[model samples]
Target chain A: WCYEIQTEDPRSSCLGPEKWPGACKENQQSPINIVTARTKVNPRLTPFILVGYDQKQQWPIKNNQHTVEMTLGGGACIIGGDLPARYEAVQLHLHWSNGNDNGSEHSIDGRHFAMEMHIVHKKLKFAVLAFMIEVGDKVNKGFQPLVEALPSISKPHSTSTVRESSLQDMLPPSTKMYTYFRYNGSLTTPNCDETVIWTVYKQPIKIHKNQFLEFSKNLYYDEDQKLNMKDNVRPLQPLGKRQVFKSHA
Target chain B: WCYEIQTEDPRSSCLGPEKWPGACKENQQSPINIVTARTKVNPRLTPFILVGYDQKQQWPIKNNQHTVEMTLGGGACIIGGDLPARYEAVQLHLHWSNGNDNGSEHSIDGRHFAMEMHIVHKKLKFAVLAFMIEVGDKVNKGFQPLVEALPSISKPHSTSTVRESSLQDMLPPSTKMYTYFRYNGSLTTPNCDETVIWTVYKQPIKIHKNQFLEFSKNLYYDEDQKLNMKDNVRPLQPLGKRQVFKSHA
Candidate 1:
């Protein structure tokens, strides 16, 4: 829906993100280009506590016509940190583009990373834990399993079970998530619900350079591989008067 | 803009407010239909300390194509309350419609009042103090002088001076402004900048029914007095994830 569509302009069509229903145009949205210097530290932000993320299990992965989405069971949840209530990890998704750079939905200090990972949890509200990805020389062992599973879901609306793995194996350590930026935002998709409490980690998660390029190649957003899902990230939204709060200095 | 144009929809044209540039399509907008029951009180929101508002003086009033605006000198400013900086009163304006029933830009619990007054203040970013108006039995002496002056500037871009009066004369007692809903927002016009901190007071000001009707007539948005300036309020923006806060419980 992006790259080809004109967004947030006077000439937007129904296909554009701006035409989506609900709070997409309202104040306080996600995927902001964070100005790190302007961010203030909030002392109330504590380290997140992960539940049922380490046990290896098979999860349903789907090419949901937009991005590669992995659905989670009620087994996994999160607590602590700045969360107002107990939030269960409902699912996780990826936002990426074709190349090694300029793939992330959220940017930091005018820099767009190669990709972004969102672990979505819901408790009126949700908590999305976002990790910025960068292609690097060192292979990310935690991400290797999920990277290879992309082949099975290359077609649009395709569904397949990923190889036995845990959410923990696919992500960086929860302890390292102590330092992050928090904001009250909404889902980046249509009918963009303004009920999310977004946590964007400052730490960049790394993927082997070769594996990173696979996201651009094997994904299809249309039937019979007609439309490749290259640039799947929503355009960055406006960061209005809402202050971006960092967890640590 | 309030009634004719299709705003924030799939088929919006260049004529609608949604087609305007800047944060109009972004989250964190103002003039939300504030749900009073859902609002939370913030202890940091204290009483406002108004400066130079009560002193009587003459102000230049203009029919600025859209609203009846009164340009202020450097004689008034505000301090205290939740203000982070000293904001000087730049000007004051009014928003209205065809009748007394639906003129207010901001609503309380889905209720629109007779009119709305905006006292625009600025340090760097703007802080607007809004007062809702309602048609009542009592004649508002403070508002009388300004009402009669409207006829003198009926043509678009025309300017005239109102009778000797102060900002205090036209407004309710400043001490009574203890209760208000606060949020981050943007200007309600073209190139809507998201640099505003909106404060919509719960208390409504009253004016005799006759004075309120004067706002519906003798005001033109066209150079030749061809277009009457009524229903000038922007359509209510989506409230989004931004929480509306009140100074009093």
Candidate 2:
């Protein structure tokens, strides 16, 4: 069914403010601008309980042409807030830009981070937790598994396996989880179904310069195009009538 | 470094009778026209001895930009004829055209087949055994393992694992090995090194139409180009006095 909905180039397929199936035309689109001051604080939102994320498991990393994705095996789940149901983790992928300054799909008060990481889960409804990433000198030991596998999967659609990887290390510090913005939105990619529960955290994750370059320079948007895979983030969509609620400590 | 010798496109990188690092200008280029009548029959050249090829092992298939390649683990080697040393199998890959009629890298008396398979081995010197594939009603069950994994790697640089696959099944019937053409050549891809000992069989393997289509249509020259991968074969190089020897029954 994905092939049935085609566009001229990858840039125009699910691009920003453009009409393509459930994309720009959709009302409840994702990656909206979050005006921090406009959000309403709710004390009812509690710290998210991530179950089984610490358990180590082998993961398969793939450069799916569109992005770098990893399919997680069962055992991880997210619970908290007035979330209608408990959602089980399925996969995680990343979006980054060619430049050092801005690449994340969602911006904070119009500020773009170098990259964004999305951990997707689903029960009755799809839910995604977004984490902004910035370049720093800090070496994230937890991300070593994913970084080590990047060289082998340098070309698009290439894949490599990661052994004994723990997702806990890739997540931001627990103290930073006290505050987040939640809203109703659609999937960022193709067939942008408006059926997602979006959660954007206040704290940003840090990635080492070398580690960041591995992703930005190594991957190709298209092999023949010889275009390096940067700027994979979709442009910002309209906020419309969606309410952005803030979870406070 | 592979990065140092980059090209504008995959097609013209290792093209024939032209300048491309280590190719065309090289004396012993590959896929030379094999004139059957002009070949010298060598009674001393016996049937090729393929050792450990029947043993099953997992093979990693990857779409390496230019071709669909599979990396082989140890325990397989090729011996016999005038080969100076025992060559251990390293990897196997393929080349074909987008069309059904002609795509083989090598030709027999000006006749081309549907595709070509290259099984590469290395020790002190590089050696490659070539097989021509033709479309036929006869289904090759030996290729089922690879065929099943094809769907997973539909794009360039995509890769998948093949469990319990044997190189023996991919080879021609043992009886057909009595006659073959042997010469010296270079790799078909850039930088096309001229260190290969070439052995091309006279018997072309039979591939079912559907199976061949799976490879020709599913793969892309580059993921971004959205171009279907075909005609990856290098053009026939000049036979500059290199003796083409044929092994007799």
Candidate 3:
């Protein structure tokens, strides 16, 4: 059930779900195509509420060969919503492309987004809140801290720390709830454990062109190689019979 | 200069020449490798003499999806050795994989020889005299007609008729020339423009088990959907400064 990340090989037949057996055999795989019309509306799915995330502590960001990962410190947890248990925020990471074509792992009506962000939370099982990020003319003031810290950890395995406020600012305004699509799926990475409750935001976030390039071109795939971590995203998997539910219009 | 293949995608970027735009960009490209010590020595660089491969007829091997291929038929060719305008043959094809473990574009140090074979032949701007067919337990006798027609107008864009003899058996005496390694390079596919020579032949060709399944189980990656040409093959490229010479061991 273990999977090695070798970005430079024919991943289709080698690293694809068909190539992996067992739990990866589940029909509800992550990063599936999200067809808007097919999603069921669920007014019951409430707003996402956060705790301890507002006054961020020191968050440790590191380059984990595959992506830029930031570990969440104590106090940061998802407080509201009708969940079985309180899911605590664990980490956040990204997936992007070398070119502007298609990068997002999940597409809407076959349309591809430029990049994606995954804020992983855990309890007895895992819950991941996904966000799509696109390039824009203005820099997201909230992402300024991350953009600044990136250069220091540009090499894979490198690490840096940022103010908790910087991390807190990165979230959507806490005053209002955002629409999201929820489904039962597996982790997009290897072994693809299918115990995840996925919540993907309907609205995409923006980052200045410069900030986008900092990720697409600046970071190396690993500390040992000069290869850029461009197009570090995975291919979308089949959705099977799983239903995607929308929180609201 | 136009490129017909999109080897730059995940196929190339993810599985390609370590993500493209370099050594992969050159005049000489083909699946290649040679055991420095095993290459048969041949200073004369003699001409290839063919049997029953000159004639124009119907060769019925369709483009399964990846490579443009056809079976062989007709009269043999190869009139001059060092002469400018010489060499001729017919229907040629490729070898490839369904999985990452093995696909014969080329092998290193006799390491992974999942499969290998090519059908081509000659002239100054185009003189293809290369062959590599591994030995297996059962010979797919049905492959003989296309195999035979190959001897006929093996020239590019040429067709041929089928005769049981034209397809029955087309192999030089297997007793000798079994040890060889020729060079010179270019692509095995379109732009059939000849740029160099080639070498092939091995001592043993084994088909342990499921060799056929190995190929049939694979597929071709297309923008629209997956197609199983069963298997596909392409020549390895980037000849660099290496000279095309017969190995003298």
Candidate 4:
């Protein structure tokens, strides 16, 4: 859906929140503003068992006219964290404000961090692991390879190969992953399906401001460069009839 | 704040949410979509002990260019319901849409009712009790007097007197008060100070569609009647670092 008001296309009518069908308006929707103090602690939210994510390999990353996505391929799998089944890793993407500050689809205690990352996995139902990203002085070694690949996928529908890096390296340390908020939510985008489990990690992924600016300023939402993809995010949805549970032990 | 985008006035710049100071963007804001299933049950949220509200009296009702409000004289005070101290009733207001459809500021499980009524009480901080209103076959006795007085206050800044009606007659049955969602939130309008303890009741107040149209269709947001105040609600704010608690036996 178009972020800013765009009247150029006829299909734009059903695009954005103005029309997006009724599902987007459902109760169990996502990219919610996570209220930290309100969450309950659940000991069952144990550590995740990740398989084959530590291996380094080049993967296809694409610019989907809205946000950038990288397919993790089928080899990696995520188990545990109270999920009912083993969910195979599919792809990972990010939601960023075109500038460097407050672009995350999900927020923590109303603090809009610089960016947010989502790793999608699937079995019977989808499970998404969300990470809040912020700027730090140190250049993140885990993200350097991905940042280098943004230049090639600058145009819409373009695909490029990202440098080899293990998914584990990109994730927060295991200790940090233990404390996360789990809730039943939907896809953040349209046709907004409510068939997913969401986990938002407490710790954030750190990247240099320069590194974030490299992609945030460079990506375009159109083929002719008419619209640069900035602030490509839906505003926070209300947390209706849902409780977010955190992992304590 | 101007609901629709109006460029007629320069001060309108800061009038709407586009630029309503930083406090509006802060955490713990109000008029949130109350998610029923997500709320926690707290038995201590007992029935309220209301004083002097049952006394029939005429109150000043006014149209403040945005919403219709009625001041409840100092005689009425609300106690109990787990609040630490007594809070005296000040004013009551309503948020409505231009149409008969969903206009309420707070929603239930994504279901937007026709209107929302707020009874503001104050002591150390503001405590707003919200009642969802919808169209039903029968007319509402509690709202008849208020609806009859809307004609005099149809113009902006207009004030008129309303016939006497005990506050208890306007409230839902006492049994319904035991089931409510409570949260810490801010004022719904600009200068959104996070000084409110919000309680949204489970039961709704019903009125005839024709009665609601009397006010929803006639009230103007300007002196010359240029703009009608409809959908005069800020979209739901993120429920950051907050938990909603429900009262039960």
**C-alpha TM-score for every candidate:** 0.48, 0.47, 0.46, 0.48
The backbone clash count of each candidate, in order, is 5, 6, 44, 5
Instruction: Kindly list the per-residue Cα lDDT of model 4 for residues A1-249, writing each as its tens digit.
Output: 566444355563436665577588888887788777888989767556566665678988999887889988776877556788878989999988754467888888888888889999988399998888888898999898888998888899999998888787787654356578899988888888999899888899888889988876678887887666767777788888989887864
Model 3, native contacts kept: 0.00
Per-residue CA lDDT of candidate 1, range B96-179, in tens?
876767689899998999899999998839989899998899999989889989999888888999888878667665435657
TM-score of chain A of each: 0.91, 0.90, 0.88, 0.93
Please give, for residues A1-249, the per-residue lDDT of candidate 1 as tens digits: 444422333554336665566677788777789899999989867556565665577888889888888899666877556577778888898888766678899988889988999988979288999999888899877776777889989987888887788786566643355578988889888678888898999888888888887876888765767556767778888888888899887
If chain B of candidate 1 is superposed on the true chain B, what is its TM-score?
Answer: 0.92
Best by lDDT: 4
* Tens digit of per-residue lDDT, candidate 3, span B100-195: 335566555645455555656655144554444454567555444544443433333434455544321333332333345676666544443337
Off by over 4 Å in 2: A1-17, B1-249
lDDT of 4: 0.79
The residue-by-residue lDDT of candidate 2 on B42-82, one tens digit each, is 76465555666656778889888777789985467765556
Error of 2 at B43 (Å): 84
Per-residue lDDT of A28-51 in model 3, one digit per residue for the tens?
787888888989988657665455
What is candidate 4's lDDT per residue for B5-103, written digit by digit as tens?
A: 343555545356756775887877876777777888886675565566556789889998778989896658776567877788999998887555568
User: What TM-score is obtained for chain B in each of the predicted models?
Assistant: 0.92, 0.90, 0.30, 0.93
Please list the residue runs of candidate 1 whose C-alpha ends up more than 4 Å from where it truly belongs after superposition: A1-249, B1-14
True contacts kept of each: 0.00, 0.00, 0.00, 0.00
At residue A209, give the lDDT of candidate 3.
81
